[PDB]
Amino acid sequence: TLTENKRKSMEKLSVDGVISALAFDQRGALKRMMAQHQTKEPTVEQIEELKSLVSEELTPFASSILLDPEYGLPASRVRSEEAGLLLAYEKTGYDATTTSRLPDCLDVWSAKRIKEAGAEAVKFLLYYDIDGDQDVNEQKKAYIERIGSECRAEDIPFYLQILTYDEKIADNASPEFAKVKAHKVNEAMKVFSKERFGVDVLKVEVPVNMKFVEGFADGEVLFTKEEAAQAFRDQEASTDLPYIYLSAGVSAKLFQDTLVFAAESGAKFNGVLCGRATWAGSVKVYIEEGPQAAREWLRTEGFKNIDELNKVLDKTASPWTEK
Amino acid sequence: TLTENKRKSMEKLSVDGVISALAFDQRGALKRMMAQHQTKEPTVEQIEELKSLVSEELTPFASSILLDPEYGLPASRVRSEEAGLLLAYEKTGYDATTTSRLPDCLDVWSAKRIKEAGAEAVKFLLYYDIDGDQDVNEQKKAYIERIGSECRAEDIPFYLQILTYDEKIADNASPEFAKVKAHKVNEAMKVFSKERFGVDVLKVEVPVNMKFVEGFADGEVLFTKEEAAQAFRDQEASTDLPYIYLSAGVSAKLFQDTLVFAAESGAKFNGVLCGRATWAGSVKVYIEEGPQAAREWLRTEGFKNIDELNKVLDKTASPWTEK
Numbered sequence: 001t002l003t004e005n006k007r008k009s010m011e012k013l014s015v016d017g018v019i020s021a022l023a024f025d026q027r028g029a030l031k032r033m034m035a036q037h038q039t040k041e042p043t044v045e046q047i048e049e050l051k052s053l054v055s056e057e058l059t060p061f062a063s064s065i066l067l068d069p070e071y072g073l074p075a076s077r078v079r080s081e082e083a084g085l086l087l088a089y090e091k092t093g094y095d096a097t098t099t100s101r102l103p104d105c106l107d108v109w110s111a112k113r114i115k116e117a118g119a120e121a122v123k124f125l126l127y128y129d130i131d132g133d134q135d136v137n138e139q140k141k142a143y144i145e146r147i148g149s150e151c152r153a154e155d156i157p158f159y160l161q162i163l164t165y166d167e168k169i170a171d172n173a174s175p176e177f178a179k180v181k182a183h184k185v186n187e188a189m190k191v192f193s194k195e196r197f198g199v200d201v202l203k204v205e206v207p208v209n210m211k212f213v214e215g216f217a218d219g220e221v222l223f224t225k226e227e228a229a230q231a232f233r234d235q236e237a238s239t240d241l242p243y244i245y246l247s248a249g250v251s252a253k254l255f256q257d258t259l260v261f262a263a264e265s266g267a268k269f270n271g272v273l274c275g276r277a278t279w280a281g282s283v284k285v286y287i288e289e290g291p292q293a294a295r296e297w298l299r300t301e302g303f304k305n306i307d308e309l310n311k312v313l314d315k316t317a318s319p320w321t322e323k
Numbered sequence: 324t325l326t327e328n329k330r331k332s333m334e335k336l337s338v339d340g341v342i343s344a345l346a347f348d349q350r351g352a353l354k355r356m357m358a359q360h361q362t363k364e365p366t367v368e369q370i371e372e373l374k375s376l377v378s379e380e381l382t383p384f385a386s387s388i389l390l391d392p393e394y395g396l397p398a399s400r401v402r403s404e405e406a407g408l409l410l411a412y413e414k415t416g417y418d419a420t421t422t423s424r425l426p427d428c429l430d431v432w433s434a435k436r437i438k439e440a441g442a443e444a445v446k447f448l449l450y451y452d453i454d455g456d457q458d459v460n461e462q463k464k465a466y467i468e469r470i471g472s473e474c475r476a477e478d479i480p481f482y483l484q485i486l487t488y489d490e491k492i493a494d495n496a497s498p499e500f501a502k503v504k505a506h507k508v509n510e511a512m513k514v515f516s517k518e519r520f521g522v523d524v525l526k527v528e529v530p531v532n533m534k535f536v537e538g539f540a541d542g543e544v545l546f547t548k549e550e551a552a553q554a555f556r557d558q559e560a561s562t563d564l565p566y567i568y569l570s571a572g573v574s575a576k577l578f579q580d581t582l583v584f585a586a587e588s589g590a591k592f593n594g595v596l597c598g599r600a601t602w603a604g605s606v607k608v609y610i611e612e613g614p615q616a617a618r619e620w621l622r623t624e625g626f627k628n629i630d631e632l633n634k635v636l637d638k639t640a641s642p643w644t645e646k
């Protein structure tokens with residue numbers, strides 16, 4: 001169920017019950033991309049400006065935009081008046097020396113402060129290995145309970161992003177991980193759909209690596225179209241919450257093709273929180289050719305990208321209202 | 324204002340609006356006391372047992388008991404039927420290699436789990452130097468906001484304990500700290516009485532080191548009685564929340580005389596969360612003579628301490644229900 005304010009907030013993040021959200025809370029990742037044509041270390045001014053350019057030019061075509069409080073608050077204030085705002089709550093990345101990947105909130109932030117900054121949702125990223133250390137997962141579950149409680153008190157939607165992994169499989173893109181991905185994703189969704197975690201929307205991976213599915217694979221084939229289709233249906237059955245897809249390790253085209261396949265298979269996903277593929281190109285242009293060039297790229301190539309995505313969403317997504 | 328459930332919980336922790344609570348969530352501190360008396364490391368069983376003995380013998384004379392989830396859950400189950408339960412939420416102690424003393428919740432606990440474990444309040448201890456690093460304090464304030472929000476969502480009273488310190492003063496028993504203690508205590512109370520922190524009751528230090536007050540001092544005198552009295556009045560004017568005193572491990576007699584002085588000075592404190600001043604002597608007995616001897620100490624010296632404290636509370640404390 002949703003409280004009146006949470007419902008209203010959800011409405012501000014979507015169009016006709018579909019979430020077509022632009023993800024741009026990248027921090028370290030964006031800086032690194034920038035580093036790729038580096039006269040110097042990329043500045044705070046540069047990072048914040050590029051987020052503002054993307055926000056200004058592309059949010060007229062997105063139902064909402066996800067930003068980080070570190071670099072993204074200026075960008076958040078210049079978003080289209082028709083677009084809602086989500087703010088990221090987690091610290092980026094994880095310790096590569098250990099396998100625990102424990103969650104940690106931004107040090108001077110709280111759900112209250114996120115709401116005060118104008119957000120209509122709190123977004124939090126959790127790494128979860130359902131088969132991992134039981135004590136680690138207990139600590140993780142407790143952490144999410146806390147955040148869910150915060151969001152209930154502040155009456156602001158809780159968007160929980162889950163990225164799955166295996167403590168013992170180094171590469172998420174490996175065939176080894178592909179074989180267990182459906183299990184990692186769908187079981188994690190079952191866990192955090194439980195009422196006690198206070199989640200309003202799940203941001204999740206597609207439950208299969210399409211690069212190993214028949215018809216989509218350029219190399220080894222691990223799954224038939226039917227087995228992949230069943231994974232999407234299993235995922236649909238793993239939660240009664242609204243859920244939306246993230247894009248990871250795939251091109252814009254493959255992602256869009258996957259949304260088509262997802263819908264064809266019977267998945268009732270309620271939209272996406274996608275970004276990188278849409279605005280990636282603007283980054284090279286911005287560093288090299290300046291902000292005015294980047295603005296033009298976003299107005300042209302940028303619009304093309306997000307518009308193609310929206311037209312795919314129009315024929316594949318299902319409304320969260322239709323619960 | 325209290326919600327219906329918070330009020331009911333406050334009622335279970337109090338009698339006629341006065342909190343006569345027994346504090347025994349000590350961990351590191353208890354371990355240190357125990358250290359003073361034996362060769363070996365204290366065992367889990369010994370810590371759990373002594374906590375259960377104090378709970379069994381003394382909670383018939385307290386309106387509630389504060390315990391720690393780590394060693395205190397068995398003790399919580401054998402408390403008097405008439406006594407309420409608070410559970411601690413913070414990890415014990417602080418990092419002595421730095422001056423920030425940052426707060427940290429127990430890893431596998433949440434406010435929801437504390438409530439599920441039968442507690443009628445969440446207690447959290449924060450070290451705070453009002454004059455300290457501003458970024459450190461911003462992080463501390465954000466952290467308390469989160470907990471206050473949790474407690475609002477779970478509809479469970481939030482007891483915030485504040486222990487003051489100075490980043491540049493090593494010993495809080497020193498005359499140097501004594502001269503700034505009132506400032507540290509009263510300004511901290513003011514800050515954490517702000518609505519945004521969601522506190523229901525403050526557990527605080529008396530705003531004076533009584534050992535340096537004329538009439539109480541056996542050595543150097545830093546303060547006249549009128550100056551000490553004014554600090555208590557300043558404290559009363561620093562919050563409109565209920566507040567209760569901790570004993571800080573002074574003698575039972577000095578704590579009792581302090582409460583009388585507080586009341587005479589004009590402090591409208593609403594009770595105590597008193598630990599060491601009551602049961603401290605049981606530790607030596609339990610270690611050296613065993614549980615039965617400790618039980619007999621509690622039934623005699625322990626009772627005498629808490630009985631005389633209750634008599635003093637009866638004539639000094641002010642009801643929270645008058646608010």
Ligand SMILES: [Ca+2]
Nearest residue numbers: 516517518563
């Ligand atoms: Ca107020």
Ligand SMILES: [Ca+2]
Nearest residue numbers: 559560562563
């Ligand atoms: Ca007052």
